[PDB]
């Protein structure tokens, strides 16, 4: 269903303009997106055709914002192991939870939730999201349809900067008005590529 709309060239594309240097370059694959893809129900499988298309697009905008074209596994340099404190999540001694994969999965709380939906234990083997394909992917969806707003505000009419605030509403109103053009950029290129209209409430 979903690689009806996003085709191997569509994909090829959007990893293609990544520098030969980057971590990502072969890293992130259409095997590991379309596998990941199809084990959340609903996710870009909802709707209408323009609607299908939007969230796709919505997708992509925002993992090519966060991987600079997927180009980008880990975070660079973390300033910090992202562990806060915690019984129903305990940190890991030894162990980052630094931004890795498409939707950068960041936070001990985030991988532990994160880990039980997939498959994998994110306490424990938090790395396994930079070193798997089909798992870095499901991160990425999982948030999108399991931990976030993302997949409820593009299919209530909450357009693309719906997706914004659901993901770091710290950037809308002036927040950070670069990090939404960027991000909206990408949006309108993508969603041209595959030829649909970009909607309304475009921007944050």
Not at 124 to 141: L, M, R, W, Y
Request: charged fraction near 15%; hydrophobic fraction near 30%; proline fraction near 3%.
């Amino acid at each position: 269903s979903v690689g009806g709309i996003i085709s191997q060239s569509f994909f090829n594309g959007l990893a293609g303009g990544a520098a030969s240097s980057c971590e990502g370059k072969g890293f992130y694959t259409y095997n590991a997106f379309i596998a990941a893809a199809n084990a959340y129900s609903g996710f870009g499988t909802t709707g209408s055709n323009d609607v299908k298309k939007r969230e796709l697009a919505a997708f992509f905008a925002n993992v090519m914002h966060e991987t600079g074209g997927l180009c980008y596994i880990n975070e660079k340099n973390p300033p910090i192991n992202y562990c806060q404190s915690s019984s129903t999540w305990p940190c890991t001694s030894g162990k980052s939870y630094h931004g890795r994969g498409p939707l950068q999965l960041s936070w001990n709380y985030n991988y532990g939730a994160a880990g039980k939906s997939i498959g994998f234990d994110g306490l424990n083997n938090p790395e396994k999201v930079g070193q798997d394909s089909t798992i870095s992917f499901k991160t990425a969806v999982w948030f999108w349809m399991k931990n976030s707003n993302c997949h409820s505000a593009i299919t209530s009419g909450q357009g693309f900067g719906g997706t914004i605030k659901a993901i770091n509403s710290m950037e809308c109103n002036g927040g950070n008005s670069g990090e939404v053009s960027s991000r909206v950029n990408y949006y309108k290129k993508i969603c041209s590529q595959l030829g649909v209209d970009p909607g309304a409430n475009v921007s944050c």
